[PDB]
Amino acid sequence: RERACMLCGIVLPGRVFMQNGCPNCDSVLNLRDSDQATVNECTSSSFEGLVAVGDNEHSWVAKWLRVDRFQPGLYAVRVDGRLPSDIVAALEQYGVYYRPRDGSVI
Amino acid sequence: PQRLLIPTVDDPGIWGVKVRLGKEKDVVRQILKKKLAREGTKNPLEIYSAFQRDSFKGHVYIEARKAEAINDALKGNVNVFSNNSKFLVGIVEYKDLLRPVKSSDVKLTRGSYVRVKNGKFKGDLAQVDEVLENGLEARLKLVPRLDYGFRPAQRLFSEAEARVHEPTIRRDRDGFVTYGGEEYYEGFLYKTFRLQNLIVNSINPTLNELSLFQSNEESTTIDLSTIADSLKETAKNLVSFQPGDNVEIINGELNHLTGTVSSVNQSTIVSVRLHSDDDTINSETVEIPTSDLRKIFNVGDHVRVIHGKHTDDTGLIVEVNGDKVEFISNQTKRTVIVFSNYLIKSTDSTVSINESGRFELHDLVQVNSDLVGIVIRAQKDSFDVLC
Amino acid sequence: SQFPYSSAPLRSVKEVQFGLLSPEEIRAISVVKIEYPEIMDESRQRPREGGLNDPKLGSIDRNFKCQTCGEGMAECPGHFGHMELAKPVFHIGFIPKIKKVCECICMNCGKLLLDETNPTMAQAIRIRDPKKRFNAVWQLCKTKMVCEADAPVSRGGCG
Amino acid sequence: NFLFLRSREIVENQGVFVTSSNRVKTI
Amino acid sequence: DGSPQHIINEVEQLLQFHVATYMDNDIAGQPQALQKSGRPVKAIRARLKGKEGRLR
Amino acid sequence: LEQMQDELIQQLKLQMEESAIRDANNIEQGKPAIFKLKLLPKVKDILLRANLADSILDNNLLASVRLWLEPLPDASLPAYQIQKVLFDAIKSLPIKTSHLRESGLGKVMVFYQKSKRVEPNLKRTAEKLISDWTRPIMG
Amino acid sequence: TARLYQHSSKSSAEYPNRPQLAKYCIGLAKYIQSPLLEYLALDESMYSLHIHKHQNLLPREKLIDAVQTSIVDIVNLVGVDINEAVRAPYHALALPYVCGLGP
Amino acid sequence: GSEKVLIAQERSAANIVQVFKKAAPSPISHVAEIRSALEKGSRLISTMQ
Amino acid sequence: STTITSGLKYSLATGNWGEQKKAMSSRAGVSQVLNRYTYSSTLSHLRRT
Amino acid sequence: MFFLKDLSLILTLHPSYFGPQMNQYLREKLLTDVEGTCTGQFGYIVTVLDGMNIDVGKGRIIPGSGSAEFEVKYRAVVWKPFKGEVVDAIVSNVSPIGFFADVGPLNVFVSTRLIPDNLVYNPSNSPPAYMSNDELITKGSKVRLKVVGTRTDVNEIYAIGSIKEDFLGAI
Amino acid sequence: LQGEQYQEIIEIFGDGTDYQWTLDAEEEMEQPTSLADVFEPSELKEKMLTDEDNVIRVTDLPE
Amino acid sequence: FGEMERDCMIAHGAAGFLKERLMEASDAFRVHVCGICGLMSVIANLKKNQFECRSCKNKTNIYQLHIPYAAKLLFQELMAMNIAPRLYTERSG
Ligand SMILES: [Zn+2]
Ligand SMILES: [Zn+2]
Ligand SMILES: [Zn+2]
Ligand SMILES: [Zn+2]
């Protein structure tokens, strides 16, 4: 069982997301401090395009996927589902702009 | 930004390697684990990223700078084939390898009418009352198929008959009834169905089901936007052209021009010779997209119905009311009004009646309790009997 | 007298004309379009319509009549269907001839590399047999390795 | 007593015509 | 869906191979199309040639 | 020699501009655009000739090419034959950044890429050509 | 009516997993229970019943009008329950033939 | 249930030098041939000319 | 255990001396049905090359 | 419209008729098999000119079947309607869907949608007719109609007429 | 990228406003209930969904 | 009745016996050919007495032939390979 964090794009087991949270998005999502509904709304088990990144700084793919500022690991090209409107507003409060990785927005 | 991130010549190269089918994600995970394990060592795996795509079966793409790095990453793996089936990805392909897919529709819209792929209501039209945020399932509004104690015909859940045949009905609210573990809301079943159980495109609606669904809305088919879109899709897809067809142009600089189809290439490019008062123009052939062509039907032409209730019916054009064309039928010998989208100029009928009804030609059948006759000519809708 | 009566007149073949089949003719003489790879509908008899065993193509069963002509197994000759190709492909039997034709003409303007001005070319065109005519024209135009946008005045070439 | 005779010469009703058995003779 | 030229070339070359071997399975210079039993496919060209062919 | 080709290409440029103006007026007068179709064969024959590409770039015929590709004010796209022939000619010639600057065809190319009435094959070709033209700027 | 019902698609929709003889027996039983409703179920095929020796001599419109008048007279002499007609369409077949009303 | 018999198969001996005269339409006039086979197993390994 | 068993049984049953999926290019006719028409025919068949 | 055409027929004769009266018998067989027939390609063959002096030539024996095959060439009067032609007619029937007229052997059906609106069908009239204030078209009434479409059958031709344009209708 | 060549790219390719209005008009024309167009008139008459039907239902007279 | 027997029958000069051996005593078949396109694409329905070639859109210029079934199979296999053998019942010169 693995899920893809919608915001940063990382893919980790859903129980890992629940127990420890997203190592990158915890500064704005608080996924560990969030309930299962919020974990699902920010981490989706339905995705496509497993991506393994070794060096974020120099990988052109990471820049193209906007994951060059995140922890190397399992990432998904496309993630099913988008962030909820309330979470979108909460992130916009923090000044961070959310670009969907669902592919429907480009 | 997004446009500025397109690759350059000095960006790291991308290699693709053939692997055994079904092991692509396994190879990706193995590569990531090897990179992490050798990270911080004297000889770290000098690569940058590696990935794969579901559509591109049997291929794993690694972003690196050296072929030796690829060999080192692939060293110690069993899914890699014996031969070094590696190739250099062209820089233009870099954007395409990571472009998204399935972007045709934004999402499933609540309230839309869809068809069911499988289950007890396989093929029944269903309204999308609820879309689950997971996207794998969705709660739908359906017409129940019950016998109350090979499937029963769809019918609104009748509480009185259900209690008479089964007095164990449950109640939870007003208008929301749960019978036999199934939740029926105001006579309509509400049941969650998986995304793999639905067809969200090319949906064919029937006025019977539309009325049965919209009767509870105090108005017959009040919602007609999705229906109009389906009508547009049916009109666009059903058009098929043949050489010699008289067509008219709807868009482009050549709008409102008549011409005859000369040749057909693929299904989207049609070579047309235009007709005009100028002789020099009539000797030119123009290739025109099919999306901007409308068939021209002249009065007194043999035309055969393509699709509909009057399928395989032929006749002669009598009245041309723009979109809708009227023609006198051949079998029923009566006027029928069908849209011009469902007509093809077929100068010969030669209709075969096989696989229809119960009787063939030259069948001695009993008309009634007194009259007995034989079949002289068969029709798609009736038969001709000499008694 | 072993054949059921047909009102068409009975005649005998006097000429066999060969040639290739144009895509227009293939589409015209076809009776159904083949698109579904599955041979059987649901493995419950009644092979899938639009598949490789469409009932309109003809009948090979005693109790089943053809849905196109309505004749029995002993009388149905079989009817053709057509399959649209996503991308055009070479006919395996004509690749050498395709190569020769490519050598004989220009790949841009689509015109012959030689004209009747050359006495040898006119002499070659004078012959009647199509095969020998093509052989002579290829023997001449093979050496000509450049299209001429001007007469060797414009000859219609692109240079 | 009704017989359904068909003949290729007759065009009406594709050559089908009803004739009583008492008015025909074997050929 | 998506067009990596390498994949397009591979798949179109596969289609060309299948169409060619459907009509001629004795093309010198490349391996023949084989059945699941290992026997070569009986192309249409093989139906017409030899003592047991159509003509003879 | 080359100057004669430049003169002929300038005459072709004048003919193309005049035909575009005439077709625009005819559309404004309720008549179909026919002059562009009439001139299309000669333009195709000239463009297919490779050795004249240098003279074409000297005379900046791409300006008239863009003028033909520019949609008319009635929001009606040009004939599919014209678009296909012009795209093939653009592919067939070595267009540089200087030529694009002289002609400004990038704007029309972006419009074609973004538009949806345009044929999807033309959309892909426009994306490819835009990427190829952005290639030298960034390296 | 039973013979016509064993061939009608209404029975097939009503009974998708039953033999034709079962449909024939069901038609016979329904005719015994209520001949009028069974005669109504014929819809258009009722006009093909052997009604009179020279029924075919009359024009189709006149015969149809005669059948309509007879059935309206009979159903109005009988009477129709509105609640049962709403409950079951089978009993609602008689609703259009009431005087003043129509399909 | 069927009785099968193995028919002995005749082959050229191994580990012996065979000298042959090639035909005129060839740059080769004479050929010396040998096929090698290990004693243990008596299996053909390689051929040399 | 099925590999060797099936391979040996197939080669002895059909006479094709090789793997089943490489029936072409394999030496055929190695194994034949024993001729039991008369005693002399059997003796001759068992001593054939 | 009537025409003169040179037509040819293939006639097969059974060997039992190989007698001195072969030629005359072929003549009457041709007359019976051509007079009154209806071919979609040509229309209706009404008469054969010089029916008693038609050349039949020499018949060829069909190999394997004995019967002789004769090629008979003859000149005949043929009538065929054409699209967009205005001809005279006589009404044969009146019906709510339209009226049926007869143009020689051809029977033409005209629908109400091809009839002027003022000619409202009157079923109470005896006989029922499509009548206007100054026009009344019933059974047996002369009508001038224009043939719009012709339908080809096995051995029959179906034509559709119209009276909706000028100089049409009752005459 | 770098600002000056970003300006050069803008000059070559434009911001789209030279044809943004054309795109807006195209999208306006791309976007558009009458039951006559929805289904065949024969089916509508069979299902009783025409103007004669409403007139009959409204009219205070036996059918 | 192999090829050498066919040659012996040719040498004897008996054309009727050869035709009967190869047609009546073997695969005889009846097909319909369009009088225009010359292909065996006529959709013939004998019971309804209607013949029709869709490609040429004709109903009249249609003939029937008696050919060996193997010849029909050969022509159909040729058509499967984009080769069109057209059979015509009249010469042209
Ligand atoms: Zn995250
Ligand atoms: Zn058939
Ligand atoms: Zn050239
Ligand atoms: Zn034909």
Output the 3-class SS for chain A: CCEEECCCCEEECHHHHHHHCCCCHHHCCCCCCCCHHHHHHHEECCEEEEEEECCCCCCHHHHHCCCCCCCCCEEEEEECCCCCHHHHHHHHHCCCCCCCCCCCCC
Provide the residue count of chain J. 171
Q: Best residue in D3, D8, D16, D19 to probe B by mutation, most B CBs within 10 Å? A: D16
Q: Which residue of I has its CA nearest to H4?
A: I33
User: What does the DSSP assignment read for C5-30?
Assistant: --SSPB----EEE--BPPHHHHHHH-
- Judge: B207–K32 Cβ closer than 8 Å, yes or no: no
**Nearest alpha-carbon partner for C111 in C56, C157, C62:** C157
User: B34, exposed or middle or buried, with CB in 10 Å at 0-12, 13-18, 19+?
Assistant: buried
J114/J118 Cα distance (integer angstroms): 12
User: What does the DSSP assignment read for chain C?
Assistant: --S---SSPB----EEE--BPPHHHHHHH-SSB--B--SSSSSSSSPPTTBTT-GGG---STT---TTT---TTT------B---SS----TTSHHHHHHHHHHB-TTT--BS--TTSHHHHHHHH---HHHHHHHHHHHHHH--S--SS-----S---
Residue F5 phi/psi, 5-degree rounding, is: -65, -40
Convert L6-29 to b/e letters by CB count within 10 Å (16 or more is b): eeebeeeeeeeebeeebbeeeeeb
The three-class DSSP label of residue G24 is: helix
Q: Which residue of F has its CA nearest to C156?
A: F45
Place of tokens 């997301």: A17
Structure method: cryo-EM
Q: Do residues C25 and B242 touch, judged by C-beta distance below 8 A? A: no
The three-class DSSP label of residue J61 is: strand
F75/F86 Cα distance (integer angstroms): 19
B146/B177 Cα distance (integer angstroms): 15
Which ligand has the nearest atom to the CA of C146?
3
With a CB cutoff of 8 Å and minimum separation 6, the contacts of K58 are: none
The encoded tokens of residue B52 equal 């794969």
A98/A89 Cα distance (integer angstroms): 10
Instruction: Break chain B down into helix, strand, coil percent, rounded to 5.
Output: 20, 30, 50
Residue J111: its H or E element: strand J106-111
Q: Give the CB-side neighbour count of residue B55, counting CA atoms within 13 A.
A: 16
- Judge: H7–I33 Cβ closer than 8 Å, yes or no: no
Q: Which residues 8-27 of chain B have a CB within 8 Å of chain L?
A: none
Residue F26: its H or E element: helix F2-28
- Judge: C93–E24 Cβ closer than 8 Å, yes or no: yes
Single-letter amino acid code for the residue at B24: E
For K26, which of F75, F110, F134 is closest by C-beta distance? F75
K62/K59 Cα distance (integer angstroms): 8
Residue L2's domain is classified under what CATH number? Answer: 3.90.1800.10
Alpha-carbon dihedral B52, B53, B59, B63, rounded to 10 degrees: -40
L24/L5 Cα distance (integer angstroms): 17
The three-class DSSP label of residue B18 is: strand
- Shortest distance between the Cα of J98 and any Cα of chain B, in A, equals 10
Distance F46 CA to ligand 3 centre (A): 12
The answer to whether residue I45 neighbours chain H at the CB level (below 8 Å) is: yes
Angle between helices C95-104 and C130-143 (to 10 degrees): 50
- Judge: B348–L59 Cβ closer than 8 Å, yes or no: yes
Contacts of E38 in chain I (CB under 8 A): 20-24
A87/A31 Cα distance (integer angstroms): 12
Single-letter amino acid code for the residue at B292: D
Distance A79 CA to ligand 1 centre (A): 12
The answer to whether residue C108 neighbours chain F at the CB level (below 8 Å) is: yes
Question: What is the β-pairing status of strands D16-20 and D2-6?
Answer: antiparallel
**Cα F19 to the chain's mean position, in Å?**
13
∠ CA(L86), CA(L91), CA(L93), 5° rounding? Answer: 110
| CB atoms near residue B387 (< 10 Å) | 12
How is the beta sheet containing H30-37 ordered, strand by strand? H18-21, H30-37, H44-48
Q: Do residues C72 and C65 touch, judged by C-beta distance below 8 A? A: yes
Which ligand has the nearest atom to the CA of C72?
2
The three-class DSSP label of residue L38 is: coil
The encoded tokens of residue B202 equal 């090319």
**Nearest alpha-carbon partner for J143 in J88, J106, J85:** J88
User: What does the DSSP assignment read for E2-43?
Assistant: ---HHHHHHHHHHHHHHHHHHH-S--TTSPPPB-TTSPBP--
B294/B258 Cα distance (integer angstroms): 9
Q: Do residues B303 and B342 touch, judged by C-beta distance below 8 A? A: no
A59: left (phi over 0), alpha (psi -120 to 50) or beta: beta
Options 3.90.550.10, 3.30.465.10, 3.10.450.50, 3.30.40.210; CATH of A2-103: 3.30.40.210
**Nearest alpha-carbon partner for C78 in C106, C59, C52, C54:** C59
Q: Do residues A32 and A39 touch, judged by C-beta distance below 8 A? A: no
- Shortest distance between the Cα of B261 and any Cα of chain L, in A, equals 16
A22 annotated to a ligand binding site: yes
Question: Could you tell me the CA-to-CA distances from F35 to B257, B286, F32, F63, J132 in Å, in that order?
Answer: 15, 14, 9, 18, 54
Single-letter amino acid code for the residue at J108: V
Contacts of I20 in chain E (CB under 8 A): 38
Q: Do residues G70 and G39 touch, judged by C-beta distance below 8 A? A: no
A29/A91 Cα distance (integer angstroms): 8
Single-letter amino acid code for the residue at C125: I
- Judge: C109–F50 Cβ closer than 8 Å, yes or no: no
J31/J33 Cα distance (integer angstroms): 6
| Domains parsed from chain J with CATH numbers | 1-82 (3.30.1490.120), 83-171 (2.40.50.140)
Query: Which chains have at least 3 CB atom pairs separated by less than 8 Å from chain H?
Result: I
With a CB cutoff of 8 Å and minimum separation 6, the contacts of J73 are: J6, J7, J8, J54, J55
Question: What is the β-pairing status of strands B49-51 and B59-64?
Answer: antiparallel
Q: Where do runs of H (alpha helix) occur along chain B?
A: 24-38, 67-74, 93-97, 159-165, 207-214, 225-237, 279-282
Place of tokens 């790879």: C37
The encoded tokens of residue C133 equal 């005519």
The encoded tokens of residue J84 equal 């967009």
Assess whether chains K and C touch, using the rule of 3 or more C-beta pairs within 8 angstroms: no
**Nearest alpha-carbon partner for G7 in G21, G17, B311:** G21
Which ligand has the nearest atom to the CA of A7?
1
Q: Which residue of K has its CA nearest to B3?
A: K1
C87/E11 Cα distance (integer angstroms): 11
J104: left (phi over 0), alpha (psi -120 to 50) or beta: left
Distance C80 CA to ligand 4 centre (A): 14
L72 lies in a domain? Answer: yes
How many angstroms separate the most distant Cα atoms in chain E? 50
How is the beta sheet containing A3-5 ordered, strand by strand? A11-12, A3-5, A43-44
The answer to whether residue F49 neighbours chain C at the CB level (below 8 Å) is: yes
User: To what resolution in angstroms was this structure determined?
Assistant: 3.1
**Nearest alpha-carbon partner for C81 in C122, C105, C50, C103:** C50
Residue F97: its H or E element: helix F97-103
Inter-chain contacts counted by CB atoms under 8 A, chains F and K: 54
Q: Do residues J61 and J13 touch, judged by C-beta distance below 8 A? A: no
Query: Which chains have at least 3 CB atom pairs separated by less than 8 Å from chain I?
Result: E, H
Place of tokens 């204030």: J133
Binding residues of L for Zn(2+): 34, 37, 53, 56
Residue I8: its H or E element: helix I2-14
Q: Give the CB-side neighbour count of residue I14, counting CA atoms within 13 A.
A: 17
Question: Could you tell me the CA-to-CA distances from E34 to B73, E20, F79 in Å, in that order?
Answer: 36, 14, 49
Distance F45 CA to ligand 3 centre (A): 10
Question: Could you tell me the CA-to-CA distances from B244 to B241, B271, C84 in Å, in that order?
Answer: 9, 10, 21
Question: Could you tell me the CA-to-CA distances from K28 to A106, B226, F109, K21 in Å, in that order?
Answer: 21, 18, 21, 10
- Judge: G99–K48 Cβ closer than 8 Å, yes or no: no
Helices (H) and strands (E) in chain I, counts: 2, 1
The three-class DSSP label of residue H43 is: coil
The encoded tokens of residue B82 equal 């014996």
For L50, which of B350, B361, B362 is closest by C-beta distance? B350
G13/J96 Cα distance (integer angstroms): 37
The encoded tokens of residue C63 equal 């109790």
Convert B70-89 to b/e letters by CB count within 10 Å (16 or more is b): bebbbeeeebbeeeeeeeeb
Domain tally, chain L: 1
The encoded tokens of residue D15 equal 């050559």
- Judge: G102–K48 Cβ closer than 8 Å, yes or no: no
Name the DSSP letter for residue F7.
H
A4/A74 Cα distance (integer angstroms): 9
Evaluated on CA atoms B192, B198, B202, B208, the torsion sign reads negative
The encoded tokens of residue B166 equal 């089964």
C156/C110 Cα distance (integer angstroms): 9
Residue-range definition of the domain harbouring residue L31: 1-81
- Judge: B231–K40 Cβ closer than 8 Å, yes or no: no
Instruction: Break chain I down into helix, strand, coil percent, rounded to 5.
Output: 45, 10, 45
**Nearest alpha-carbon partner for F77 in B251, B256, B285:** B251
Contacts of B221 in chain K (CB under 8 A): 35
